[PDB]
Design an enzyme around this catalytic site. Structure first.
Site, short mmCIF file in Angstrom:
data_model
loop_
_atom_site.label_atom_id
_atom_site.label_comp_id
_atom_site.label_asym_id
_atom_site.label_seq_id
_atom_site.Cartn_x
_atom_site.Cartn_y
_atom_site.Cartn_z
N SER A 126 1.01 -1.35 -0.01
CA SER A 126 -0.14 0.09 -0.05
C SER A 126 0.84 1.35 -0.02
O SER A 126 0.28 2.35 -0.04
CB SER A 126 -0.97 -0.16 1.08
OG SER A 126 -0.46 0.03 2.26
N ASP A 363 -4.50 7.92 7.49
CA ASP A 363 -5.29 7.25 8.23
C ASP A 363 -4.75 6.61 9.32
O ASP A 363 -3.48 7.08 9.74
CB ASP A 363 -5.98 6.13 7.36
CG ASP A 363 -5.28 4.93 6.42
OD1 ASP A 363 -4.34 4.71 7.08
OD2 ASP A 363 -5.78 4.70 5.46
N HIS A 366 -1.59 4.46 7.01
CA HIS A 366 -1.02 5.09 5.64
C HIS A 366 -0.52 6.31 5.95
O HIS A 366 -1.31 7.23 6.30
CB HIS A 366 -2.21 5.06 4.45
CG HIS A 366 -2.56 3.19 4.36
ND1 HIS A 366 -3.55 2.99 4.81
CD2 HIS A 366 -1.46 2.22 3.99
CE1 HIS A 366 -3.87 1.71 4.54
NE2 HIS A 366 -2.73 1.05 3.92
C1 LIG Z 1 8.17 4.03 0.57
C2 LIG Z 1 7.59 5.40 1.08
C3 LIG Z 1 7.17 5.25 2.54
C4 LIG Z 1 6.96 6.77 2.88
C5 LIG Z 1 6.21 7.02 4.38
C6 LIG Z 1 6.57 6.19 5.35
C7 LIG Z 1 5.30 5.21 5.96
C8 LIG Z 1 5.67 4.78 7.28
C9 LIG Z 1 4.40 4.44 8.23
C10 LIG Z 1 4.03 3.30 8.17
C11 LIG Z 1 4.31 2.06 7.36
C12 LIG Z 1 3.07 0.99 6.98
C13 LIG Z 1 2.28 1.63 6.20
C14 LIG Z 1 1.75 0.85 5.07
C15 LIG Z 1 1.22 -0.51 5.45
C16 LIG Z 1 2.25 -1.46 4.65
C17 LIG Z 1 1.90 -2.88 4.48
C18 LIG Z 1 0.45 -3.24 3.77
O1 LIG Z 1 0.48 -2.58 2.78
O2 LIG Z 1 -0.37 -4.10 4.19
#
Ligand SMILES: CCCCCCCC/C=C\CCCCCCCC(=O)O
Length: 389
Positions: A126, A363, A366
Site C-alpha cells: 500500500s 489514516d 498509511h
Molecule cells: C516508501 C515510502 C514510504 C513513505 C512513508 C513512510 C510510511 C511509514 C508508516 C507506516 C508503514 C506502514 C504503512 C503501510 C502498510 C504496508 C503494509 C500493507 O500494505 O499491508
C-alpha cells in the site's frame, strides 16, 4: 518465456481503439480526496481515441497497449478538463464505455530508444499501490470520498512523485494487505507481482528491460498482517531480485522499511505485538542493505535509501521537517477496523486546522501524500541525485 512468440504477434495484430477516462481531484485542496472523471476529447470537441491492442493473463486484468505516448494522453486530459487546479492530480485509463473498469494504458517504446531510463516499474504494498484493488472492489474500497482514487492516501504515493519529477511513465503492480485488500484480490505477493510484470511486458513492443527503473518495497504486509517469519520474507525478497536481474533488470531503487509500529493503528496493539514487528523490521533492514551491496558489487545500478532512518527522524521531530503531527491520523479514525475503509471520514479538528500537508499520517496505517512527496524528494536528492542512473 511466459508468453509464446505465436501468442504475442496474434495479440499485437488484433488492433482496435479505445477511449480515455480522465480522472481528477474535484477540490483545490489535498484535504479532500474526492475525484471525478471526463472522457478525453480533442480541441475540436471530437472523441479522443487511442489505437492499439488488449491483453490479459489468466488474471483477467486487461491492459491496453498503444503507440501513443503517456505525455500525449496526459496533455489531452489536461486540455479536456481545462482546470486551474494545481492539485487536480490527473490520472488516466483506457475504457470502452461507462461500464468499463479503469484499465492501465501501456505506451509502447520506440525501437531506437536511447540508453536511458524511460519508465518506472513499481513493486510492493500500500506504500506503492496506485489503484490495483480499486476496480475489484467496484470502486467502493478504499471509499473514494476519503481515499484518493484507489490510493491508500489523500493523493499520489512516493513512486508517482519520483516518476513525475523525472517526467516518466509509471507502471504499477503493487497491492498491500493492512486495509483488508486480500478480501478483493488474491495474488498480492512480491513473487506474483514479478510474474505479472514478466507476463505483461512480453506483450509490449520494443521493450528493453535495461531502460526500466524498478522500485521495490516489501515486507511490512508480511510482518504486520500475516505474522510471516523473517527468513520467509528474506527469501521472497532475494527471489524477486534474482528473477528481475535474470530477466534483464539493471536499475533499482531499494529502500529499508520504516518502523510501521510508529503508525496510529499500533496505539491499539499490545506491547508484545509491537516489539515482535519492530524486531522483524530491524532484521529485514540489515538484509536489504546486504542485498543492495551484493547487486552493487555485481555492477547493477542500485540506489539504497534508508527510509527507516528518515522515518525515525520525521516521527521524533516532525517540526524539523515541515510537519506538525506525526502521532495521529489526519482522518478522525480512533480505532483499527478494516470496515472503516468502506466509509467517508471527516478530518480531525487538528488536521482540518493545519491542513493534510502538515500531518505525517492520513489514516491509522498509511502516510499522507505530503509524507509520500517528502520521501520521494529525499530519495531524488540522495546518492548525488541518482548519479547511478
Ligand atoms: C516508501 C515510502 C514510504 C513513505 C512513508 C513512510 C510510511 C511509514 C508508516 C507506516 C508503514 C506502514 C504503512 C503501510 C502498510 C504496508 C503494509 C500493507 O500494505 O499491508
Amino acid at each position: 518465456a511466459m508468453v509464446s512468440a505465436a501468442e504475442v504477434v496474434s495479440a499485437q495484430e488484433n488492433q482496435t481503439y479505445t477511449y480515455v477516462r480522465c480522472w481528477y481531484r474535484t477540490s483545490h485542496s489535498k484535504d479532500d480526496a474526492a475525484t471525478d472523471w471526463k472522457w478525453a476529447k480533442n480541441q475540436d470537441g471530437s472523441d479522443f481515441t487511442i489505437d492499439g491492442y488488449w491483453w490479459s493473463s489468466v488474471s483477467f486484468k486487461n491492459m491496453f497497449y498503444t503507440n501513443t505516448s503517456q505525455n500525449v494522453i496526459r496533455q489531452r486530459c489536461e486540455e479536456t478538463l481545462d482546470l486551474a487546479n494545481e492539485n487536480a492530480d490527473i490520472t488516466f485509463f483506457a475504457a470502452d464505455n461507462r461500464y468499463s473498469y479503469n484499465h492501465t494504458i501501456w505506451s509502447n517504446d520506440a525501437a531506437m530508444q536511447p540508453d536511458q531510463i524511460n519508465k518506472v516499474v513499481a513493486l510492493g504494498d500500500s506504500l506503492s499501490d496506485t489503484g490495483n484493488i480499486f476496480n475489484a472492489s467496484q470502486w467502493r474500497f478504499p471509499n473514494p470520498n476519503s481515499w484518493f482514487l484507489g490510493h491508500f492516501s489523500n493523493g499520489f504515493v512516493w513512486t508517482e512523485y519520483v516518476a513525475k519529477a523525472k517526467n516518466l511513465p509509471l507502471y504499477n503492480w503493487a497491492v498491500g494487505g493492512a486495509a483488508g485488500e486480500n478480501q478483493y484480490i488474491a495474488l498480492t505477493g512480491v513473487g506474483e507481482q514479478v510474474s505479472s510484470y514478466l507476463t505483461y511486458t512480453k506483450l509490449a513492443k520494443n521493450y528493453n528491460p535495461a531502460n526500466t527503473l524498478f522500485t521495490l518495497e516489501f515486507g511490512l504486509n508480511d510482518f504486520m498482517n500475516y505474522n510471516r517469519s523473517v527468513p520467509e520474507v528474506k527469501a521472497d525478497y532475494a527471489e524477486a531480485l534474482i528473477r528481475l536481474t535474470d530477466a534483464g533488470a539493471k536499475n533499482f531503487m531499494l529502500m529499508t522499511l520504516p518502523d510501521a509500529t510508529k503508525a496510529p493503528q499500533f496505539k491499539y496493539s499490545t506491547q508484545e505485538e509491537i516489539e515482535t514487528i519492530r524486531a522483524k523490521v530491524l532484521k529485514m533492514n540489515e538484509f536489504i542493505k546486504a542485498q543492495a551491496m551484493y547487486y552493487k558489487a555485481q555492477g547493477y545500478n542500485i540506489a539504497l535509501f534508508d527510509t527507516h532512518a528518515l522515518f525515525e527522524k520525521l516521527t521524533s521531530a516532525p517540526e524539523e521537517h515541515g510537519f506538525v503531527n506525526a502521532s495521529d491520523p489526519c482522518l478522525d479514525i480512533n480505532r483499527s477496523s478494516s470496515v472503516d475503509y468502506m466509509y467517508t471520514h471527516s478530518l480531525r479538528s487538528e488536521c482540518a486546522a493545519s491542513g493534510a500537508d502538515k500531518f505525517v499520517f492520513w489514516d491509522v496505517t498509511h502516510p499522507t501524500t505530503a509524507t509520500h512527496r517528502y520521501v520521494a524528494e529525499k530519495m531524488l536528492e540522495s546518492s548525488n541525485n541518482l548519479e547511478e542512473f
